Design a protein around this ligand. Structure first.
Ligand code: COA
Ligand code: COA
Ligand code: COA
Ligand code: COA
Lengths: 382, 382, 382, 382
């Protein structure tokens, strides 16, 4: 009842209202589910559960996990569930899949995330519209980017963490520009060629966001969330809104043995942490401290880190708190350069981690989410 | 790592655009979470996870499970997730909570469901509106009541099951009227007084739907889903749209022992089944066959049954397939009379089952969902 | 080329979202056009032009005057135009009809107004909706009740006139309550029985608004437009939003002679005035001063007055400025009690004036409109 | 009480959602009103009335004629009215201005039309949205381009006229391509330089639509309105939707004499006709027959014609019915090439006619409108 990763794939990540606009989160979920099954070397008939992270579910139909599963030729007998833990959604999906295996209920599952922020709608409230009209509510704002407890944007919340660490505009901007550099370098060298599956639309084969940097504009931008003169977070050093999906097939040790399989990684452990909503940016290091403690490891044991870059400060805070070598963190770039399709990013950083690790190396992927939580997973590359 | 139910409570179920309109799914979720914690006799500080079923999540904010948890004074360190398995959502929530305990990850969790169908919005699509305009999409239809694979209403799908069993309008209507009779009788005798928690708005203390039956109108209604002359399902013998919530606190055997607690029930087993989307109505008996097989039980072992009444045919098919005594099924009425707040109904039928069972009796609660799946749980009353 | 009124009829005036909701402005316009033609004793084939006042034209189709004309069996060869002078619209319609006759172009026309404020829609702007959404604009506000030059409600503007005359809450409220008294008395005594035509929907036969007064509530209301403590205008002493229509058939002296007709009144003269938008409330007395001057008359020559009661202050200011006997003004009540369907009110007060006048008496009807204008007409009852 | 044209100006006509999108119909109306006043050589204080044609008035505020008048520094005492006769609206405006002068009521008026089809909104109906949602109605369709009596597009109606004259796709397309040729030639030679006033936005100085012809695509297009195989009208041989405005200052003979003015043209006569809505395309020749009859003229008396090109068939039918020399008709191109801002086109073709005529020449401008009417005016160039 050990947990192995058989496959780990992702779409390229597209910009908002760009190349993937005509494809739904269901469509993208089918792309990565089908390809993850193909690369797992198991038939779709062997997949027992489909677990899908998705945040902006409005307008997509009943339980998109079931739509994806059926369209991916997974048996009607297999169980399908869609889950929402904001940015952590598809990391939670992977953790749920691991748990199902750990407890002996399942042998083989597919865990993924998919998000089409391009197709998030606007809301008209139920019940008659009063004299004077009403605001059309943006799903992206209300259900995606605004903290619902503090009733302010996650980027305004993150400014608190900026101040708490005495970070500067200069550091946030340098971090962002370096995320773009690493992403550009990775694409130039073909470093994403093991993990990216092309999406027919005529075909998207490369991430879009990293090409959009206008360097000379970065110091000219005005703070986007805090405008009292002390602001630091801008459109350039915050992640963007994006479309994409990512998937892993998980299988038990028994399946691996019986099938003579060659899994690509092993899930060793996971941890979850929670803090005040406003402080969500520092939850990942808390989850990692728990992860390493329970695993009898320390930071130096870990070859590579993925910390999802909700904002540049997310990366900086993580690196500073855990006293990491920055050169071992997000080595192929992170979401500030690659984009952040909310429901997909949890699985997306696990996919990137798996394929950056060399054999026998340990990696940690960690992600925060609006509301004050974070999830982390420890993996060993085989 | 046995799984006990410490508490099981629900709101009254309100009609569409009625007494609970001013309360959100978050508000209702807080009501039942707070009261479930109170009746568990554990402090809110002991709750380790909050797992919430919800289908129509549009406009409600980030991850309503986290909103509910925080507003219920559960620690910021506790983990919160919202899940969508259409009508099965909060049965899945309970199963997830049981699994977390089974695997030794958690000791104490709260599992619930909440749905405010009154506040489900309409959708305007992203991107510019073409010449000629566009349809405003109803969340209730698109994300709640329409099967997304067959692209037709669940009630049209259920007509297939009607034909497959050779059920008649006469049987469907008699079943419906009897669900209302049992609900009315239960409320007259106070049978829901252990489980219902009143909701301040001036206060809702009783289910609303069961009072709305107009008997003489039932045979006069025209089929609502199939109009070719062979239709049988009507507004009266189908469940309605509704607002409500239901919650259980679950705890491990270790917690019970250490705390000298008196749990009210034990979760013995669960099962999940899946079939073709159009055949969703017959999935519950399939789940129960699995449940009983793996538990070494047969149908006669079971004192009481709850089968969620998506439609009258749901109950009839279940009873016929499993050859049950109808007098042991939904003894206090079912959703055709009580209402069907989608995300809440899974937990709601577990709550009703728990409090109808007498000590040492075994009960089964089963629920189907759009897309072709069903979930079932076996419980022992203590 | 003298101008005679052959007929003058109106619908009852219905409250907002009340009995006439299912009828469009076109439907109501057809009712009064058909009945005005009937009572003119001329065939519909003789009507040469149809001139219709209407303010909230959104969603009603092309040129509602043509829709009304065709559906009223007026020849396809007859000319149809819809005009907007806000509250003055159908007084302008009558003036246009008189001018067409005066200049010898036409012999016979129908001039009317129709407004269904119940069916005024909300607006979604053209072009893609930005991040964060957009306000749904209320047609009633934007195109009806807000002054577009001052960008504030007409009721806020009218507070300036209140201050300029040193009027008091006490006077405004007493005026309002008296408008209701006169309307109630008129309906009790059958005084509207010559002019009102019933509207089949099962039938509306009486004005609705005047029955809605709650006397004891009037001094308890808070100012609706000005909230700095100096406000005086409230929901009770302002006119309401309403549905209704009114129509007159006009004919030349030549037609009357050739047809041996018995016209009910003669149009002697008209005048139009304009002032600053904020001062629109005092434009009617300015128009009347011009009207009387050019006609060689003085105020004492005039038996009865109709001053459209946009607000109670409209009536008070008019009476004070012209030094009128209040008992000769709006003797059957005015729009504060009867309602104010914007596009219809100009013709509606001419209809009420015509039928309150006794033979050989002179009457003046005057009406202000948002933007700072007013229209007045002098008539002689035959 | 003769009627003279002192000035006649227009904006360039912009394409839908193009260069003038940021300008409202009020903004464009102010541009042409101010410039018409400037070129009339009278001060704005002398303008006694402002009469404005406009069809799609939704969202624009109260009585746009008053907004335009005030913003153009015309006295608050001057009278302002907005009128809707669909495509004929601003020809009707000019006729109303002429009548006001003819009857001796006014000496000096400005008559214009303005339309911003780019800013026509969508409509949400009043009252609560039913289960299943509702269609968002396009103002352009419902209030502009659909005949409201036949409940079909004006282009489908026009196919009847195509059949009645045995016109062919080949003739309609050749006519369209020639309208574009004449427009292109006119702009190349500077023929619109007397009438066009540039619009600051950085500035629009030339009509946009005529540049958009793709010749080789014209025979490839499918009929847009009638798809049973007998259709002939396409996007290329129908007019387009557009933004623009046009204005004339009119003055009496007395004003001209007293002011020592040099008017540019004289309005000799006007006529109006009406037919069945479906037959609206043949109303213009009917109006012209009346115009010429009452004026003691015949077709050969007329140097130049403007027939508004709602469709290519509009021009062809007019030319055929009146047996005109095509080389004297729309000599600088017509609306199929220049665009058709509905409320503006009536005045726009009068402006183009005035400035194409040489001194002492007679011209006729004629325009049809949805609903079955047409207006025509006879002018003499001075
Ligand atoms: C509304 C939203 C779409 C921003 O609106 P937008 O118009 O797309 O913002 P832009 O990308 O155009 O950026 C604003 C300006 O910054 C500039 N800019 C943005 N990214 C840049 C980069 N990487 N380099 C240089 N300049 C950049 C743009 O050129 C733009 O133009 P301007 O400076 O001339 O005004 C916003 O939702 C978003 O993209 N991100 C929100 C941040 C966030 O919370 N993300 C979620 C992670 S949890
Ligand atoms: C749209 C929706 C709200 C139905 O619209 P509705 O207007 O509320 O339908 P009504 O409740 O008014 O019922 C229609 C008619 O049946 C009658 N009716 C409904 N329930 C009745 C009952 N229990 N007894 C007698 N008559 C009943 C009503 O009087 C109504 O009036 P009418 O016969 O004079 O026309 C629909 O979404 C719904 O309620 N249920 C859908 C069924 C479904 O799939 N439910 C989800 C379970 S998965
Ligand atoms: C938005 C609009 C509909 C007002 O909203 P509304 O909800 O209908 O306002 P109401 O009629 O309910 O009045 C508000 C309160 O005053 C009271 N009220 C209104 N008219 C009253 C009367 N004649 N006597 C006693 N009380 C009255 C109501 O009871 C109401 O209840 P509350 O005091 O318990 O709060 C507004 O557009 C309107 O009706 N008139 C605007 C005034 C105006 O400019 N009219 C146009 C003329 S140019
Ligand atoms: C909805 C509306 C905007 C048409 O939609 P649209 O997308 O703008 O239509 P288009 O201009 O793109 O034309 C459709 C196609 O014809 C082609 N086309 C249009 N005008 C053309 C021209 N002058 N030459 C060659 N091709 C042309 C376009 O290239 C387009 O592309 P496609 O052939 O590759 O599909 C419509 O309202 C309209 O423009 N006119 C309606 C006609 C009408 O009644 N006008 C009112 C006068 S009363």
């Amino acid at each position: 009842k050990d947990v192995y990763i058989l496959s780990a794939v992702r779409t390229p990540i597209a910009s908002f209202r760009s190349t993937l606009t005509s494809l739904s989160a269901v469509d993208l979920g089918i792309v990565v589910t089908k390809e993850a099954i193909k690369r797992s070397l198991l038939p779709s008939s062997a997949i027992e559960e489909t677990i899908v992270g998705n945040v902006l579910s409005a307008g997509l139909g009943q339980n998109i996990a079931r739509q994806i599963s059926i369209a991916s030729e997974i048996p009607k007998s297999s169980q399908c569930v869609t889950i929402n833990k904001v940015c952590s959604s598809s990391m939670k999906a992977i953790i749920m899949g691991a748990q199902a295996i750990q407890v002996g209920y399942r042998r083989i599952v597919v865990a993924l995330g998919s998000e089409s922020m391009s197709n998030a709608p606007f809301y008209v409230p139920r019940g008659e519209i009063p004299f004077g009209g009403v605001q059309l509510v943006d799903a992206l704002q209300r259900d995606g980017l605004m903290d619902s407890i503090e009733y302010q944007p996650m980027g305004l919340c993150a400014e608190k963490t900026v101040k708490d660490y005495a970070f500067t505009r200069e550091q946030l901007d340098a971090y962002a520009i370096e995320s773009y550099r690493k992403a550009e370098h990775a694409w130039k060298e073909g470093a994403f060629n093991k993990e990216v599956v092309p999406v027919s639309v005529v075909v998207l084969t490369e991430d879009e966001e990293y090409k959009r940097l206008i360097p000379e504009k970065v110091p000219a931008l005005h703070p986007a969330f805090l405008k009292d003169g002390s602001g630091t977070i801008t459109a350039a050093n915050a992640s963007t809104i994006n479309d994409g999906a990512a998937a892993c097939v998980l299988a038990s040790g028994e399946v691996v043995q019986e099938g003579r399989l060659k899994p690509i990684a092993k899930v060793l452990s996971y941890a979850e942490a929670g803090v005040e909503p406003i402080d969500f940016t520092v939850a990942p290091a808390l989850a990692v401290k728990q992860l390493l403690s329970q695993s009898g490891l320390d930071e130096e044991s870990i070859a590579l880190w993925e910390i999802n870059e909700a904002f540049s400060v997310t990366g900086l805070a993580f690196i500073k708190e855990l006293r990491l070598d920055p050169k071992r963190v997000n080595v192929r770039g992170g979401a500030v350069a690659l984009g952040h399709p909310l429901g997909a990013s949890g699985a997306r950083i696990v996919v990137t981690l798996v394929h950056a690790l060399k054999s026998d190396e340990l990696g940690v992927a960690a992600i925060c989410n609006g509301g004050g939580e974070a999830s982390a997973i420890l993996i060993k590359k085989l």
